Design a protein around this ligand. Sequence first.
Ligand SMILES: *C(=O)[C@H](CCSC)NC=O
Ligand SMILES: [Mg+2]
Ligand SMILES: [Mg+2]
Ligand SMILES: [Mg+2]
Ligand SMILES: [Mg+2]
Ligand SMILES: [Mg+2]
Ligand SMILES: [Mg+2]
Ligand SMILES: [Mg+2]
Ligand SMILES: [Mg+2]
Ligand SMILES: [Mg+2]
Ligand SMILES: [Mg+2]
Ligand SMILES: [Mg+2]
Ligand SMILES: [Mg+2]
Ligand SMILES: [Mg+2]
Ligand SMILES: [Mg+2]
Ligand SMILES: [Mg+2]
Ligand SMILES: [Mg+2]
Ligand SMILES: [Mg+2]
Ligand SMILES: [Mg+2]
Ligand SMILES: [Mg+2]
Ligand SMILES: [Mg+2]
Ligand SMILES: [Mg+2]
Ligand SMILES: [Mg+2]
Ligand SMILES: [Mg+2]
Ligand SMILES: [Mg+2]
Ligand SMILES: [Mg+2]
Ligand SMILES: [Mg+2]
Ligand SMILES: [Mg+2]
Ligand SMILES: [Mg+2]
Ligand SMILES: [Mg+2]
Ligand SMILES: [Mg+2]
Ligand SMILES: [Mg+2]
Ligand SMILES: [Mg+2]
Ligand SMILES: [Mg+2]
Ligand SMILES: [Mg+2]
Ligand SMILES: [Mg+2]
Ligand SMILES: [Mg+2]
Ligand SMILES: [Mg+2]
Ligand SMILES: [Mg+2]
Ligand SMILES: [Mg+2]
Ligand SMILES: [Mg+2]
Ligand SMILES: [Mg+2]
Ligand SMILES: [Mg+2]
Ligand SMILES: [Mg+2]
Ligand SMILES: [Mg+2]
Ligand SMILES: [Mg+2]
Ligand SMILES: [Mg+2]
Ligand SMILES: [Mg+2]
Ligand SMILES: [Mg+2]
Ligand SMILES: [Mg+2]
Ligand SMILES: [Mg+2]
Ligand SMILES: [Mg+2]
Ligand SMILES: [Mg+2]
Ligand SMILES: [Mg+2]
Ligand SMILES: [Mg+2]
Ligand SMILES: [Mg+2]
Ligand SMILES: [Mg+2]
Ligand SMILES: [Mg+2]
Ligand SMILES: [Mg+2]
Ligand SMILES: [Mg+2]
Ligand SMILES: [Mg+2]
Ligand SMILES: [Mg+2]
Ligand SMILES: [Mg+2]
Ligand SMILES: [Mg+2]
Ligand SMILES: [Mg+2]
Ligand SMILES: [Mg+2]
Ligand SMILES: [Mg+2]
Ligand SMILES: [Mg+2]
Ligand SMILES: [Mg+2]
Ligand SMILES: [Mg+2]
Ligand SMILES: [Mg+2]
Ligand SMILES: [Mg+2]
Ligand SMILES: [Mg+2]
Ligand SMILES: [Mg+2]
Ligand SMILES: [Mg+2]
Ligand SMILES: [Mg+2]
Ligand SMILES: [Mg+2]
Ligand SMILES: [Mg+2]
Ligand SMILES: [Mg+2]
Ligand SMILES: [Mg+2]
Ligand SMILES: [Mg+2]
Ligand SMILES: [Mg+2]
Ligand SMILES: [Mg+2]
Ligand SMILES: [Mg+2]
Ligand SMILES: [Mg+2]
Ligand SMILES: [Mg+2]
Ligand SMILES: [Mg+2]
Ligand SMILES: [Mg+2]
Ligand SMILES: [Mg+2]
Ligand SMILES: [Mg+2]
Ligand SMILES: [Mg+2]
Ligand SMILES: [Mg+2]
Ligand SMILES: [Mg+2]
Lengths: 96, 76, 63, 51
Amino acid sequence: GFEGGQQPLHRRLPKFGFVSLKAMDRAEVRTSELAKVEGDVVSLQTLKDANLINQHVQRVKVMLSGEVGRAVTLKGIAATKGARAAIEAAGGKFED
Amino acid sequence: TRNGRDSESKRLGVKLFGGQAVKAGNILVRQRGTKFHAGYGVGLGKDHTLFAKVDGVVKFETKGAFGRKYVSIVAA
Amino acid sequence: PKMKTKSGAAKRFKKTAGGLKHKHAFKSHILTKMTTKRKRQLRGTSMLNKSDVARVERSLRLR
Amino acid sequence: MRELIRLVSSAGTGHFYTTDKNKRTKPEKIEIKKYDPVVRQHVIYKEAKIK
RNA sequence: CAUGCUUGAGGUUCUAACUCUGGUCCGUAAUCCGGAUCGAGGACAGUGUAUGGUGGGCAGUUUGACUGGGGCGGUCUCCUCCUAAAGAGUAACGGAGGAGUACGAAGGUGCGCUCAGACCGGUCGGAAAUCGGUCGCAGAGUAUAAAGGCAAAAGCGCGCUUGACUGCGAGACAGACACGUCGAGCAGGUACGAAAGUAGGUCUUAGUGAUCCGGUGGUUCUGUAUGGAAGGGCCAUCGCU
RNA sequence: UCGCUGUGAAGAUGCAGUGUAUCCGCGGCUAGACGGAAAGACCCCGUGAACCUUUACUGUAGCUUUGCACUGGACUUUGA
RNA sequence: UUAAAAACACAGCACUCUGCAAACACGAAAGUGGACGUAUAGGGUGUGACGCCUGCCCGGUGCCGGAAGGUUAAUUGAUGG
RNA sequence: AACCCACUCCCGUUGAAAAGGUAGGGGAUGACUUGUGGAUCGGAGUGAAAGGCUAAUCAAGCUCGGAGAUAGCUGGUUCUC
RNA sequence: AAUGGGUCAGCGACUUAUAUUCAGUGGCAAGCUUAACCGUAUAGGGUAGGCGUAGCGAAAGCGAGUCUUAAUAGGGCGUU
Ligand SMILES: *C(=O)[C@H](CCSC)NC=O
Ligand SMILES: [Mg+2]
Ligand SMILES: [Mg+2]
Ligand SMILES: [Mg+2]
Ligand SMILES: [Mg+2]
Ligand SMILES: [Mg+2]
Ligand SMILES: [Mg+2]
Ligand SMILES: [Mg+2]
Ligand SMILES: [Mg+2]
Ligand SMILES: [Mg+2]
Ligand SMILES: [Mg+2]
Ligand SMILES: [Mg+2]
Ligand SMILES: [Mg+2]
Ligand SMILES: [Mg+2]
Ligand SMILES: [Mg+2]
Ligand SMILES: [Mg+2]
Ligand SMILES: [Mg+2]
Ligand SMILES: [Mg+2]
Ligand SMILES: [Mg+2]
Ligand SMILES: [Mg+2]
Ligand SMILES: [Mg+2]
Ligand SMILES: [Mg+2]
Ligand SMILES: [Mg+2]
Ligand SMILES: [Mg+2]
Ligand SMILES: [Mg+2]
Ligand SMILES: [Mg+2]
Ligand SMILES: [Mg+2]
Ligand SMILES: [Mg+2]
Ligand SMILES: [Mg+2]
Ligand SMILES: [Mg+2]
Ligand SMILES: [Mg+2]
Ligand SMILES: [Mg+2]
Ligand SMILES: [Mg+2]
Ligand SMILES: [Mg+2]
Ligand SMILES: [Mg+2]
Ligand SMILES: [Mg+2]
Ligand SMILES: [Mg+2]
Ligand SMILES: [Mg+2]
Ligand SMILES: [Mg+2]
Ligand SMILES: [Mg+2]
Ligand SMILES: [Mg+2]
Ligand SMILES: [Mg+2]
Ligand SMILES: [Mg+2]
Ligand SMILES: [Mg+2]
Ligand SMILES: [Mg+2]
Ligand SMILES: [Mg+2]
Ligand SMILES: [Mg+2]
Ligand SMILES: [Mg+2]
Ligand SMILES: [Mg+2]
Ligand SMILES: [Mg+2]
Ligand SMILES: [Mg+2]
Ligand SMILES: [Mg+2]
Ligand SMILES: [Mg+2]
Ligand SMILES: [Mg+2]
Ligand SMILES: [Mg+2]
Ligand SMILES: [Mg+2]
Ligand SMILES: [Mg+2]
Ligand SMILES: [Mg+2]
Ligand SMILES: [Mg+2]
Ligand SMILES: [Mg+2]
Ligand SMILES: [Mg+2]
Ligand SMILES: [Mg+2]
Ligand SMILES: [Mg+2]
Ligand SMILES: [Mg+2]
Ligand SMILES: [Mg+2]
Ligand SMILES: [Mg+2]
Ligand SMILES: [Mg+2]
Ligand SMILES: [Mg+2]
Ligand SMILES: [Mg+2]
Ligand SMILES: [Mg+2]
Ligand SMILES: [Mg+2]
Ligand SMILES: [Mg+2]
Ligand SMILES: [Mg+2]
Ligand SMILES: [Mg+2]
Ligand SMILES: [Mg+2]
Ligand SMILES: [Mg+2]
Ligand SMILES: [Mg+2]
Ligand SMILES: [Mg+2]
Ligand SMILES: [Mg+2]
Ligand SMILES: [Mg+2]
Ligand SMILES: [Mg+2]
Ligand SMILES: [Mg+2]
Ligand SMILES: [Mg+2]
Ligand SMILES: [Mg+2]
Ligand SMILES: [Mg+2]
Ligand SMILES: [Mg+2]
Ligand SMILES: [Mg+2]
Ligand SMILES: [Mg+2]
Ligand SMILES: [Mg+2]
Ligand SMILES: [Mg+2]
Ligand SMILES: [Mg+2]
Ligand SMILES: [Mg+2]
Ligand SMILES: [Mg+2]
C-alpha cells in the first residue's frame, strides 16, 4: 500500500456499505444437486445428511441451474420462479 | 526575481484532419473562440468545441463572406 | 502465520465476479458549487483501474 | 461574500435545492418555481437556512 | 407577622472524636515505642478520594523542501502570453501579468438597434454635458489579467419568465492513479414564440481542498430472544489561508 | 622502482616523443613517492543521537483551592 | 593529563524568607539534618577590603496587599424534549 | 631545608615513564600536610565552580540482560556454458 | 596520485517455519480434499471444515438475471 508518501488508495476513497448478519445462516442449492439426497425428499436435515450445505445453515433457496434428476418433494425450502416450474416438470411436487 | 509562474497546457488544436472517418460525438477541434466554425453535420460545444453529429468524413472548407473557415462532414 | 488483511482496504473495496468495486471521491462536502452533471456522474460504483489492481490485491492479501 | 442558502419545496416532501445569495444587496427571500422529482411537477420553492 | 418541619451560609462557645517532636508513672536497667494519668489545642489541623490554579523542579518529542555549497532573502496551488524549434507536450532562483470572486439578473426566450471618434450649426457649460446634420466602419464594447473570438452580432434595450430542471446518456478529448473536459439523443415535467424552434447557467479559458470525523433533511434497508427503539447503511447537504 | 616536454579522472617511475645511464654497497640531507598514523573534528546530508534553554507542544513531582469521609453538642445572625 | 589567570573564594555590604513541631533539604513513609540552635539565630540571592558615592522610571514581567464587582471546577438537578 | 604544589626553558614523544627528568620556581604555624578506619554514587553523589571528579573510562561510570534494537547509509557476496 | 588487500592455510554471507499467488508436472473429476484425532500405526478410518458448480445489489431481497430509475427506457456488472 505504500506509494512514496502520496495519499494511498485505501485512504483516498470512501468507505461504503454494511455487512449483513442476516445472510450468515443462508445457503443456495442448484436444481442439479437435488438428485443427491437419499430418497425423494429435500429438507434441511436431508441436505445436511448429504454434504450439500453446512451444519449451521437455516434457510435454503433453490435456483435454476441444470436439470432435476428425479421427482423430489421439497419440504420447508424456498425456490425461485423458474426453479419451481422445472421441478413439477419431472413429476416433483412442492408442499410447504 | 518575481516571475516564476505559468499554467498547465490545455492540449488545444485539431484532433481529426481532412479525410479521416468520423463517428457521431467525435470531437474534431478544440478552441479558444472559433478559429473554425461549425459547418454541415457539426455542432458547437459551450466552450467552442466542434463535435461530429453524423457519420462521414472531415471536409475543412473555407467559404462564404467574412472568410470563415468551416468544418463539415460529408458522405463516405 | 496467517496473513492479516488490511482493515481499511476491505471497507473500501468489495470483491465481486467482475473485479473490485469502490465508490467515488469528491462527494463528501462542498457540493453546492459543483455541477449536477458532475455530482450525478460520481454517484455509482466502478471497477478498479488495471494499474491499481496489483497494489490492492496485495493489501487485501489476495496475492 | 455570498452566504449559502437553501430552497425547500412547497410540497410535503423534504426535497431541497441549494445555492448562494448576497444578503446585503437582496433582503428579499427568493421565491422561485422549480421541479420536484418526488411529486414530478413544477412547484414553488422558498428560501431557508443552510444550517 | 412569634410559631411549628427541613435545609443553605456565617459567627460564638463546649468536649467526647482526633493531634501533641509537653509533664510524671509503669513495662524497664531504656530521651525508642506502647499503656495510664495531668496539660494544651479541638471538630480545627491532618490523611484518603474527586476537583480548579500554579508548576522547565522533571520527562517524551517536534522545529519542511527547493537552492549554481549551507545560512539570509525569495518561492510552494490555479489562469494568460513568450521561451517552445508552423500537430500535442517540453526546463531554469528565465522574461511579463492575473485569481482564491461577481450576478435572481449581468440567466432563458421573442422582438427591436448599431459603437469610438472627427467636423460643422446651436441658450449660458466650451477642448469636453444635452440636440441636429455629414463622414467613419469597429480604431468601441465584453463584470474581472492576457490570448483567441464576436453580424444569426457573443455588443445594446424592452416584454414575459426560471432549462442556474430531475433520471440518464451513444460517442469522444485528455490522462500513472485519484480527478478532469465536450456532448447528440431518450423519458418526465416546464418557459418564451403564430410557428420552424431555442433553453441541462454567463464569449471561452482562473475564482480552489482527498479521506477520516461530527451535524442536519429524507428513506420499500438493517436493527444481537421477540415487538419497538438506540446505533448503522443509502440519497441530499454543512463544517479545514 | 631515471630526467624533460606533452597527453590523461584535469599536478605521471610506469602512457607518447625524446635525452641520458656499466652491476652493487656505506656514511649523510630530506625535494617527491599527493610518504606513515587516525573510515576528516571544518562544510553539507540522515524525516540520525545526546545534553542544554524558554512566554514551542503535551504531560508531570511538589505546592495550593473546594465537595465527601474520619466529624460531634448548644446558641445565635441571615436564606429558601 | 596542552589554559593558574583578570576566573572561584574571601572579610565587609544589602535585599528577602523563617516565631520553632521554624523556613529549607534527604526520604512513597517513619524519621533525619538545620540544632540538643531560637531573630545579635538559621536559609536563599546578588555585590565583593578601604575612601567618596550609589541619580530618574512601577509602563512590561515578577513579588506583596485588598476585597467590591465580572468570569470560573468537581457537585446539585428546576425546566423542557 | 624536609613536606605539599607545578610558573619557565630544554630533552624526551617507538619515552627510563600511557604525563617524567635536569636546571631555575611558589607556599612552608596554616583556609596547612599526612597515616589509619568510616560516610555519601549514577539523572545520582561531591564540587573555594574548571561540565571538574566518581578506579588510566564522564554534557551522565562499569557490568550483565531487553538484544541479533534500528541503520532509506558505507563495505562484501564464492563453479561453468 | 580515489577505496581495500604483506603472504599462505583453515573458516566466512539469500536459510527455516507458517499463510498464500503464478508456472511446470501428476491424481481424481461436477466434483476435489481432509484437520485434530483413532489406529497394525507412512496402511486404513475420520469429510467437522475449505474451495468449486451463479450472479446482481449497501442491504432486505430477487435470481439467468439483478441494480439505478416514475420507466418492460437507456446504462453498469453477470450468463452459451
Ligand atoms: C577551518 O579552517 C577549520 C578550523 C576548525 S577549528 C574547529 N580547519 C581546520 O583545519
Ligand atoms: Mg458439510
Ligand atoms: Mg510570469
Ligand atoms: Mg520567470
Ligand atoms: Mg509549461
Ligand atoms: Mg501555452
Ligand atoms: Mg446549446
Ligand atoms: Mg475487519
Ligand atoms: Mg454521501
Ligand atoms: Mg467535495
Ligand atoms: Mg480535656
Ligand atoms: Mg525537630
Ligand atoms: Mg511515650
Ligand atoms: Mg479538619
Ligand atoms: Mg481539608
Ligand atoms: Mg487532600
Ligand atoms: Mg525538556
Ligand atoms: Mg510545558
Ligand atoms: Mg526538563
Ligand atoms: Mg522514541
Ligand atoms: Mg528530538
Ligand atoms: Mg531535545
Ligand atoms: Mg511536525
Ligand atoms: Mg536543504
Ligand atoms: Mg546559494
Ligand atoms: Mg558554486
Ligand atoms: Mg556547485
Ligand atoms: Mg531560508
Ligand atoms: Mg502573445
Ligand atoms: Mg507547439
Ligand atoms: Mg515542432
Ligand atoms: Mg524536463
Ligand atoms: Mg499574486
Ligand atoms: Mg453579456
Ligand atoms: Mg439575459
Ligand atoms: Mg453630436
Ligand atoms: Mg445582422
Ligand atoms: Mg488520443
Ligand atoms: Mg425538453
Ligand atoms: Mg405556448
Ligand atoms: Mg437485547
Ligand atoms: Mg428485536
Ligand atoms: Mg434510524
Ligand atoms: Mg637509478
Ligand atoms: Mg593537461
Ligand atoms: Mg605531467
Ligand atoms: Mg608499465
Ligand atoms: Mg612512458
Ligand atoms: Mg617514453
Ligand atoms: Mg645509505
Ligand atoms: Mg634528517
Ligand atoms: Mg624524504
Ligand atoms: Mg602530501
Ligand atoms: Mg565505521
Ligand atoms: Mg568518513
Ligand atoms: Mg559543528
Ligand atoms: Mg523533517
Ligand atoms: Mg528525508
Ligand atoms: Mg491537587
Ligand atoms: Mg597562581
Ligand atoms: Mg576557578
Ligand atoms: Mg541573614
Ligand atoms: Mg563579581
Ligand atoms: Mg509593576
Ligand atoms: Mg502598579
Ligand atoms: Mg492577591
Ligand atoms: Mg609523601
Ligand atoms: Mg592541583
Ligand atoms: Mg600548566
Ligand atoms: Mg637551562
Ligand atoms: Mg623550594
Ligand atoms: Mg623542578
Ligand atoms: Mg608570601
Ligand atoms: Mg618561604
Ligand atoms: Mg587527620
Ligand atoms: Mg553505595
Ligand atoms: Mg556535576
Ligand atoms: Mg579517571
Ligand atoms: Mg547515568
Ligand atoms: Mg541519558
Ligand atoms: Mg571494566
Ligand atoms: Mg574497571
Ligand atoms: Mg547489530
Ligand atoms: Mg527487541
Ligand atoms: Mg562488491
Ligand atoms: Mg603510484
Ligand atoms: Mg584519499
Ligand atoms: Mg590506488
Ligand atoms: Mg568508500
Ligand atoms: Mg570514497
Ligand atoms: Mg592499504
Ligand atoms: Mg489438473
Ligand atoms: Mg441489463
